[PDB]
Symmetry: D4
Subunit: 221 residues, 8 copies
């Protein structure tokens, strides 16, 4: 199981910061891309990511996950549609440029959508006056200068097994703010006070390196 990236932008370069060590195949039609992809220590596959026979050429079936990021949403959607006809199980992460098309990328079959231009534009217009939101996003989601965001799983037979959010007191015990809990494909933001934790649940929250460290300790029993 390996990672396939369709298209190449700064996004997919930043993506290879955390996959550089894993076998990554980049599928793009432009030749000039070969140089850049090999600069990042990834495999390059020359072909058209909108063509079904070329998606297979890059082992899309049986692959760990596919990241789609082409030059228009038109191409991005069409590429997704191709993957779903090749393998309906493989995880698809795709970038959406236009807001209109977030819905389309999902209906094409993308598992998770990323809308960086929708965010950017929204953060711009809000930050005209103040935009403390903007510098939050910049410092937590972009730079992670002091704080980071974490997905921590509750392991089987955890200390928090069957413990309500109220009793768990996660924020004061560990320092991490609890944003929400994830089960399956579903995230419950700001969970009810008496929600009960299970093994396999995902805790999502903001915290510094140490507060995160305390969190991981606080969970295994």
């Amino acid at each position: 199981r390996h990672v396939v990236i369709c298209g190449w932008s700064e996004s997919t370069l930043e993506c290879l910061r955390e996959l550089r060590g894993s076998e990554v195949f980049v599928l793009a039609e432009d030749e000039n891309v070969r140089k850049k992809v090999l600069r990042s220590g990834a495999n390059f596959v020359h072909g058209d990511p909108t063509r079904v026979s070329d998606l297979e050429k890059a082992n899309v079936r049986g692959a760990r996950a596919v990241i789609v990021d082409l030059e228009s949403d038109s191409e991005t959607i069409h590429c997704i549609l191709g993957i779903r006809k090749i393998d309906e199980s493989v995880r698809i992460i795709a970038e959406a440029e236009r807001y209109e098309n977030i819905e389309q990328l999902r209906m094409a079959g993308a598992d998770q959508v990323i809308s960086p231009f929708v965010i950017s534009g929204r953060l711009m217009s809000r930050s005209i006056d103040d935009g403390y939101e903007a510098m939050f996003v910049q410092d937590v989601l972009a730079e992670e200068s002091t704080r980071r965001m974490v997905e921590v799983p509750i392991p089987e037979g955890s200390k928090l097994e069957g413990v309500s959010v109220l009793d768990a007191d996660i924020h004061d015990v560990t320092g991490v703010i609890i944003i929400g809990v994830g089960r399956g494909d579903e995230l419950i933001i700001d969970p009810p006070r008496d929600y009960s934790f299970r093994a396999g649940d995902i805790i999502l929250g903001i915290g510094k390196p140490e507060e995160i460290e305390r969190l991981k300790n606080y969970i295994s029993a």
Copy 2:
């Protein structure tokens, strides 16, 4: 006061959903852009955002804010530098493509920096396995489908003035998670338990429309 936009992408289009009805002047060299900018109900100024004389031609001095989003960070930086030479007061929001260049846009004189490709790429790599963080960002920062992030100010003569975060009990009172407090240019994420609120402080948090309303009530009168 009016808003000047340098360059044109989907970001700046998405940006105009919120200023649509305000005096917005878009400065770009490409002729094809006039067509789209007039489609969005904004003014068009034909010039080179990197040339100082064209920046003045677009009323950058004494403008409310300038948003900089050009085709490369090279240009973005060069544009900012031109603005800082016309007016060192005017608020500058700029989007950075490469990570290495976030530091540079600040040194050039940008007030708030946005890094959509840094976020996008980082979200991509971590969402290969799970990515509940990814769908959080998607549903609150991008789509605002159920929840939203808010900046509410503490009015002069507030009910919460001189009251600590522990005493304020804002989470249990209103439903809104308090992420941080802004004073001046400084955002304090997860503020000290005994931190004292002042008039003019900005509350940054996540909430549903109703939970937001209860917060607005909870401050004034």
Copy 3:
């Protein structure tokens, strides 16, 4: 109610041979297209037919039909999807370039697809030796030099109402070779001999101009 054409090619031009006298609106982004479109006696709408806001600008909702034929299947698919989110009733006729994408075009929401490239290329390989098929296609489906394909509806109170296909004996009476009968969205090619006609049925036949005239009379009053 009018016809909207997304994109411009020789197909969409040949299409105006039969609507030449109707309000046809052509939506395309390339400026060069205007000149050609106005030489055809057609309305031109400048815009991106993959952008929902531009499709609506072209009065796609409540139009007679939308013809989609863009530079790539990628865009053609995307366009269809956008139309389908503006109006799910409007009839969509779309041209597929690649074979793999005929079924993508239907699953996007096009009511009728055409694969001129697939027909053409398949016909090529088959005409290397003989190819009486190719000259059938050319002389009947392209030039209509002597014979034509016809769709003739069986009107209310028709002479043929409730008459069996063998009993009707249309080929020997009229001259027209009956290929199939259409009801609703379903075409029964070579219908069983004991099939009954109803008012509303469509007869699909090959025939000479006089032979077709003879059919129109044998049906009504």
Copy 4:
């Protein structure tokens, strides 16, 4: 005896679906085309198909057939002219974009013309209202989902030799709709009832795999 293809499009790619296994020379001047051609399993000769020296380089002389599909009818007509100047015998199959030029493709020398854009354009305009015709052509000339078009010869000493059309009663005996009969270079569509079959005639008809198979038996032995 081998096949020469001048120009590269989705049509010529679809051609090699049926030619894969035989010796094909593809002549175009774009280099990008080498890649797609060798992964299609054909020989590639880089050069200008409108230039006679390059056509000769591509073994047009004494080829089984030459298929011409260039970017404009200008080039396609010029190409055919060249081929006829090298070899006036070789079967020329050429694709006409514009209607006006179908007449010219023949006058230049092409033995059979295909006009995909003309067919497509006409099917579009017709299918606005109903278009059961479109879905016939789609499901028999393109997809061959249930029915196909056949060209079966009458072999030497066949059961049907010297038998009249009415006497042969082919539709009822076999299930196949007889469209026409080919003698020499001409197709007689809907032949007279008393037409006599000869060894060497070609039957052009519509039928399913079983009906087709029944037809081949019905003639020989």
Copy 5:
């Protein structure tokens, strides 16, 4: 009756030095050509000279003559074919780039071919050693600096009517070297000594302007 020019090169600008005073319509697709064509006191028609409807648009039927000079031979031919399809009578002067195609221009329907590239290439290799031929062509066919080639008609009731070439003694009486004599469509280069002149014959030969005036006088009245 008026002159129609397809395409635009330096040739066609030089052609206009002697029609400037007549109505000339240049038919080209390039917008840039408009500026140049109006700088010569010539009319501009915007259109595709290989498309028959654009050819008709520019009054090709009933035009005095059509000059065809397009960007490739492929086109020049296609253009000529279109003109011949509108009017089989109209005089066609066509410029030929490749030698291969001098034949094809004539078969397409050109009344006179000009092959400046062929002439030029031959003069090049020829003039490496000597090329006295080269400076003749330069000084008589290009510059006409002292001499020039003449076409002079023999008027009705001419002093030369019925006089043989020997008896007429033209070179010695007038100074004009006779190259040939034209009747109908036939050009006799170096006419035999006993060739008899007729009213309507064209004398073709080289001469200074005084030698030409001498000939004019020597034939008429």
Copy 6:
């Protein structure tokens, strides 16, 4: 000694039909040109013909002749200027686009100018009415179908040495029309009746292959 060719048109390719078997080097900057240049059996030198160091690179000093035919007159002139700067003796044959620049190539330092565009334009305007001149240029200077122009040298101790033009009676003895006589750098078109031939003079005239052969014999031995 060898031929150096700056630039590449159909002119230069035609030029090579007569040198094919000589070491000819084509100096051009374009990569596409390599293909075509090696397709004619010529050598490719990659350089900028207007850059003197690249000019030297291609053995311009001490080369038999240099043929200049670049894409604009600005370039052609420039080139000629470098070659003259590298060597004032070397034979330069140069093609002229605009009439304005025939003077400029000669002053730049070209030995013989060819102006096919000027010739072709004049022949166009001329041939609207008649143009028997046109078909002469076509059949004698371009195609040489039955006649051609010759340059025949008078050998040392020729039978014509010291014989006058009248006494030589060349036309009547040989069949060749004499146009002019070449001495040194000077061409005397239509030489006076009493011009005395010398060993080294060049007879320039039009003739059939047999008429030319007759002349060669008539002069020597």
Copy 7:
């Protein structure tokens, strides 16, 4: 007497900073240049500066001076040649890119040559080590921070008329470093100690605005 400028660059723009107030015609091929030229307050003529007819359209004849700065030395040379055909008197100032062509620009007819790329590259290579030379040129010929270069003429009835270099002792009297002396068309840098001044001689020297001011005083009255 007005100024014609051929071609547009930052140079010709920097030029108009000192000319704005006088009649300037700018001749350029590119349309985009119009807006920037009228923003600079000079007349713009659209046309080909390498063509005589267009140069005449731009009023080169009897202009005060013509400045030539086209995109290649090729064009600049051709351009100058054209001007010299129109007016052999007009002062031609031209900019040389390549060093090899400075000699060509003069031989073409340019009165003064400026070689900014040659000065630049030369200053780049020297300054690797020290480069106090680089900062002199920058601070005197470019920025004129504290000092600049002067050309003060010696008027009729001059105090210095007939006085020698040693006796005039110009540096000690005025602070101005005497660089050279202009007589006719020729500058004598660092003249003999006993050189005697004349009215109309031009002094070329380096100085501050006060030092320069004293020199003007020092000469007249």
Copy 8:
């Protein structure tokens, strides 16, 4: 230690006249640059000199100097900033196009700036009338035909150590016109009469080669 050059122009070509034989590495993104750079005897690094990772790859750290001259002031500035973030010691020589940006190039960290466009344009306006200045610049800074600009160090134990400019009398002794004295980073143009020389001072003068040679000897041992 070696020299790194970012971007390529005739400036950087002229630069290699003085380092031709030294290890020069040229960093540019355009493939086409490769061939030109290797014709100059320099090394080519393929990369984007605005990307920090690519400046690193070019060994910018600890290089002798870095010369920046890119397509636009935007890119030139970005480059300098990248270098200063890699090494804040390395000497940066950069070329500025626009006047506004000379300010910026230094503020980005360039040790020495050159503005060939500013000089050139300034000289143009100045030289419309006379311009002996321009011919100083041309013949001394550009061509160096008779006289050169020089930087000579006063070595340790110099004859001139601690001698004033009045007492040194360098102009009358050696013939070189003393312009300024350089110490550290500062140039004192036209130094005071009684300025004392020190070991390590740089003398900036204008001299003939013998004049300069005479200075080198007057200065040592």
